Design a protein around this ligand. Structure first.
Ligand SMILES: [Cl-]
Ligand SMILES: [Cl-]
Lengths: 213, 213
C-alpha cells in the first residue's frame, strides 16, 4: 500500500491575445514542461477587451497581454519588449524605397487589423504613422491573413518580431524592413487580479516569460 | 502620350475559417501571384456562421470553407480532402498505445475547439469519437492554443493535415498518430451566391485550390 501525500503545481487558466499566443506560448510550454512539470496550462485565446472581462470575472487566472491597454484595477508586470518591423512582398520591394518614408508610400497602402486587436494602436503609435490616408480602408481580421494580403503584393504592414522569429513569413517571399521611430516595439506583460492568492506563481511565470523575450 | 486601355483580374473579397486560412491561403497567394498576377485578394478570417452571413449580405464574394456545414441557398464546389491526424506529446506517447482506442484513453483527455469552429463536429464525426466522457470540459479557442495544451501534456486532439504540413507542430515535441475511422478527413470547398456574375472566376479559383490539396 502507500502513504497519501507549492507555487508552480496544479492548474492555471491563462489568456493571451491572438498576436502573441501562436508565437510566445509555444516557447513557454516547452520551458515549463521541463522546469515546472506539474503545472498544467489551460489556454484561452481572445482579444484584449474580452480577456480583461474574463479575468475580472474569475474565468481566467492570469493574462499575457501587449501593453499599454486599459487594465484599471488590475495588477500588471511588464516582462519584455517585442520589436516591430514592416514587411513588403519581394515583388514590390523595388517599388518602395528604404529607409521607409510614409509620405512616399501610395495612399491606402498600409493594411491594419481591426481595432479590437491592440497591435494596430501599438504599431501606429510606436512607428509614428500619423497620415491616415496611407491606411487601407479594408481591415484585416487575423495576423495570418494580414500577412497573406501583403504577400499578394497589396501593400505593407507592421509585424511583431516574435511572429517573424516563429516563421510566420516562411515561404511567402517577403522582405523585412525597419519602421520609422526610436521606440518601434511593444511591451509584453502579465496581468492578474490584486486579490489573487497566487502572486508567487504569477511572478515566477513572469520571470520565465521575460527570459523568452 | 498613350491610349487608354476578363475573369481573373481585379479585386476579390474572400473569407476563410481559422482552421484553414493560416495554412492553405499561403500556398494560394503564391500560386495566384504567378498565375493570375492581376487578381488582388482581400481576405477575411472568421468562423463559419459569421462568414455565411457576410457572404449572403454581399460583404464577401466567395468563401473557402470546410464542408459539410449549413449553406442553404448557396452554390458550392468541393475541391479536395484534408486528412485528420491525432497528436500527443512525445512525453505522453508512452502512456498511450497505438492504434488509438478511445475506450483506453483517460476520461477528459480529448481537447476540442468551441463549437463555433466546425473542426470539432467534423473531427468527432469523421474519427468516430462517440464517448463524450473522453472530452475535456475546457474548450479551446484557437488551433494554436489547442496544440499548445497538448504539447503541455494535457491530452490529445485532432489536427488537420494542412496544419501539420505548414509546420504547426514544429518545435513542440509532438507525435502524430492515425485516428480511428476509414474516412478521417474533411472536405474543403468554395461557396458563393447563385446570383453572382463571377462564377467563371470562382471555378478557376476552385481549380487552383484543388491542386493545393
Ligand atoms: Cl488584442
Ligand atoms: Cl469555423
Amino acid at each position: 500500500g502507500a502513504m497519501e501525500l507549492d507555487s508552480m503545481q496544479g492548474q492555471l487558466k491563462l489568456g493571451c491575445i491572438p498576436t502573441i499566443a501562436p508565437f510566445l506560448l509555444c516557447d513557454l510550454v516547452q520551458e515549463i514542461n521541463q522546469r515546472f512539470p506539474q503545472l498544467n496550462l489551460l489556454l484561452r485565446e481572445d482579444t484584449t477587451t474580452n480577456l480583461l472581462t474574463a479575468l475580472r470575472h474569475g474565468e481566467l487566472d492570469v493574462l499575457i497581454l501587449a501593453l499599454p491597454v486599459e487594465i484599471d484595477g488590475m495588477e500588471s508586470r511588464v516582462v519584455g519588449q517585442d520589436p516591430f518591423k514592416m514587411v513588403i512582398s519581394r515583388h514590390q520591394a523595388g517599388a518602395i524605397k528604404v529607409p521607409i518614408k510614409y509620405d512616399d508610400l501610395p495612399d491606402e497602402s498600409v493594411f491594419l487589423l481591426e481595432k479590437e486587436h491592440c497591435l494596430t494602436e501599438h504599431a501606429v503609435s510606436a512607428c509614428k504613422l500619423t497620415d491616415k490616408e496611407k491606411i487601407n480602408p479594408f481591415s484585416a481580421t487575423s495576423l495570418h491573413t494580414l500577412v497573406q494580403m501583403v504577400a499578394n503584393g497589396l501593400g505593407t504592414t507592421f509585424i511583431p518580431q516574435m511572429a517573424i522569429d516563429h516563421g510566420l513569413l516562411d515561404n511567402q517571399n517577403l522582405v523585412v524592413i525597419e519602421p520609422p521611430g526610436q521606440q518601434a516595439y511593444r511591451d509584453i506583460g502579465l496581468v492578474w487580479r490584486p486579490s489573487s492568492s497566487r502572486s508567487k506563481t504569477f511572478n515566477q511565470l513572469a520571470e520565465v516569460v521575460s527570459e523568452l523575450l
